[PDB]
Amino acid sequence: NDLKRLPYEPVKGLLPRPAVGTSERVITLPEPDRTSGMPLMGTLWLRKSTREFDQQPLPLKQLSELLWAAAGVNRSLGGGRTAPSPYGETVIDVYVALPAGLYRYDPVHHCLELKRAADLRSMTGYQDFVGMAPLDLVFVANHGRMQEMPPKLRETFSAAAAGAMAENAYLYCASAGLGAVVRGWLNRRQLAEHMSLNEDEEPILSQTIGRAASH
Amino acid sequence: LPYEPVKGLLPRPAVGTSERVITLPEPDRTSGMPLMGTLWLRKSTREFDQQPLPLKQLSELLWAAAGVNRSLGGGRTAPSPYGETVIDVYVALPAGLYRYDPVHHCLELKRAADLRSMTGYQDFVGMAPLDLVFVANHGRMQEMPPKLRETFSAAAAGAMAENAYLYCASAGLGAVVRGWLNRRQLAEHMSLNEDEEPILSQTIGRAASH
Numbered sequence: 001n002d003l004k005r006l007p008y009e010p011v012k013g014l015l016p017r018p019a020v021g022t023s024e025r026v027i028t029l030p031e032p033d034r035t036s037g038m039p040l041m042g043t044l045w046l047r048k049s050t051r052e053f054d055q056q057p058l059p060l061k062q063l064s065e066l067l068w069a070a071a072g073v074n075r076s077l078g079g080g081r082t083a084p085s086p087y088g089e090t091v092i093d094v095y096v097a098l099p100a101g102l103y104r105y106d107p108v109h110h111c112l113e114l115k116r117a118a119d120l121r122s123m124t125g126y127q128d129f130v131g132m133a134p135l136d137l138v139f140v141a142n143h144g145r146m147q148e149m150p151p152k153l154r155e156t157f158s159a160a161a162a163g164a165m166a167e168n169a170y171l172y173c174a175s176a177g178l179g180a181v182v183r184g185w186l187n188r189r190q191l192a193e194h195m196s197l198n199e200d201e202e203p204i205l206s207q208t209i210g211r212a213a214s215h
Numbered sequence: 216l217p218y219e220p221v222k223g224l225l226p227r228p229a230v231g232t233s234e235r236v237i238t239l240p241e242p243d244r245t246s247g248m249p250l251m252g253t254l255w256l257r258k259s260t261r262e263f264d265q266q267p268l269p270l271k272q273l274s275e276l277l278w279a280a281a282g283v284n285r286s287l288g289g290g291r292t293a294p295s296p297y298g299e300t301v302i303d304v305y306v307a308l309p310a311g312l313y314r315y316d317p318v319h320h321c322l323e324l325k326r327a328a329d330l331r332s333m334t335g336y337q338d339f340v341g342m343a344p345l346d347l348v349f350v351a352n353h354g355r356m357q358e359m360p361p362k363l364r365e366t367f368s369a370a371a372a373g374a375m376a377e378n379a380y381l382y383c384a385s386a387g388l389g390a391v392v393r394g395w396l397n398r399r400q401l402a403e404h405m406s407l408n409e410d411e412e413p414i415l416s417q418t419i420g421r422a423a424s425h
């Protein structure tokens with residue numbers, strides 16, 4: 001029983017796989033829906049972790065709503081977001097590893113901007129028995145926007161903000177019949193290198209998303 | 216513009232009978248505002264009306280943040296590292312500080328004092344009917360690597376506070392998660408054990424009228 005708590009085996013030597021598809025510079029996303037969908041109370045009942053997935057990609061509508069749920073602008077006045085953040089600073093940027101490329105989600109313009117023309121799915125650097133899925137979200141902390149915050153609270157603020165955003169994604173997945181699993185076992189430096197992140201950018205959590213496997 | 220620390224403010228005496236265990240009505244609702252609606256209305260509120268939350272609303276709020284959504288296995292509404300509770304949720308009420316027990320869906324008196332707005336920082340958040348306090352229990356993380364305990368408890372607490380924010384958006388309540396905490400001072404006020412530390416506090420109530 002305690003054996004589940006043993007630290008996971010590191011995955012050594014993996015390189016980014018070649019991009020599959022057309023690795024477009026910008027992917028424009030459709031406007032997210034505002035009225036309809038499963039009641040919040042229903043989504044809380046069904047909120048769970050999934051580790052085996054079907055490989056079918058999310059339709060563009062679902063990719064859009066997921067990204068908006070996690071990191072989107074919900075108030076035009078001031079660019080308020082669907083999730084909180086310390087001092088209103090955008091401390092977390094959401095990246096998306098798709099088979100066609102690694103993208104950064106831009107909330108103000110609700111689109112994806114190419115960060116790397118490579119498939120960086122399941123590059124957490126640890127064997128946590130989470131299978132291959134259509135996409136991974138990576139919640140990256142931007143230390144450049146945290147310098148007016150007390151240093152000893154930055155990991156708590158980054159992790160809490162990332163947690164809230166990952167929770168919005170979980171709840172969206174539950175509303176839309178999708179599986180999700182947040183993953184904190186990250187070789188942060190290795191993943192930061194694969195993602196071509198700047199020195200002040202640190203991966204905090206990832207989240208593997210897709211339709212749950214058929215059996 | 217950066218928040219300043221406030222001096223030693225002592226806790227207020229509890230108002231009421233301070234019952235030792237409060238039974239909460241069983242969580243059974245599956246209806247209410249669509250998730251997308253709650254996401255659209257998710258925001259922080261800092262000025263509140265003082266009217267207490269009815270029992271049913273308090274029960275639902277606690278269940279959203281910390282409750283059992285799967286009876287067999289004790290799976291929770293929020294994720295947790297290794298499926299083990301690393302966060303204990305406390306509720307600071309006028310009548311006393313209570314610990315929410317997810318398995319029995321009830322409140323157990325922790326201290327007969329009013330500990331609302333005991334963060335130790337001046338973040339301009341007004342008095343509200345209650346605070347939720349998310350406590351990292353390091354006693355339940357001794358087999359987890361030290362370097363991950365802060366990230367995992369903070370990410371678990373953030374998800375729980377997020378479920379709470381969303382519930383508040385669905386119910387027309389205001390909420391604000393607060394992370395600027397003098398943790399040691401607040402832990403002392405809460406009578407927490409040495410290996411338990413408040414990491415986030417969340418002030419909740421109806422938004423102020425005038």
Ligand SMILES: Cc1cc2nc3c(=O)[nH]c(=O)nc-3n(C[C@H](O)[C@H](O)[C@H](O)COP(=O)(O)O)c2cc1C
Binds near residue numbers: 049371
């Ligand atoms: C901060 C945090 C980090 C997590 N890290 C991982 C991880 O690295 N790998 C994994 O498979 N699951 C991870 N999980 C998921 C938990 O294992 C999962 O929440 C737990 O099994 C309970 O299942 P449930 O989400 O269905 O309630 C993490 C959860 C949290 C809150």
Ligand SMILES: Cc1cc2nc3c(=O)[nH]c(=O)nc-3n(C[C@H](O)[C@H](O)[C@H](O)COP(=O)(O)O)c2cc1C
Binds near residue numbers: 081084
């Ligand atoms: C980790 C974290 C800690 C926070 N701490 C405080 C705090 O101590 N005091 C406060 O007034 N607000 C706090 N907030 C709330 C943010 O200031 C707020 O989310 C931000 O201003 C944007 O407003 P919004 O929540 O309406 O989107 C915190 C938010 C996060 C994510």
Ligand SMILES: [Mg+2]
Binds near residue numbers: 410
């Ligand atoms: Mg203990």
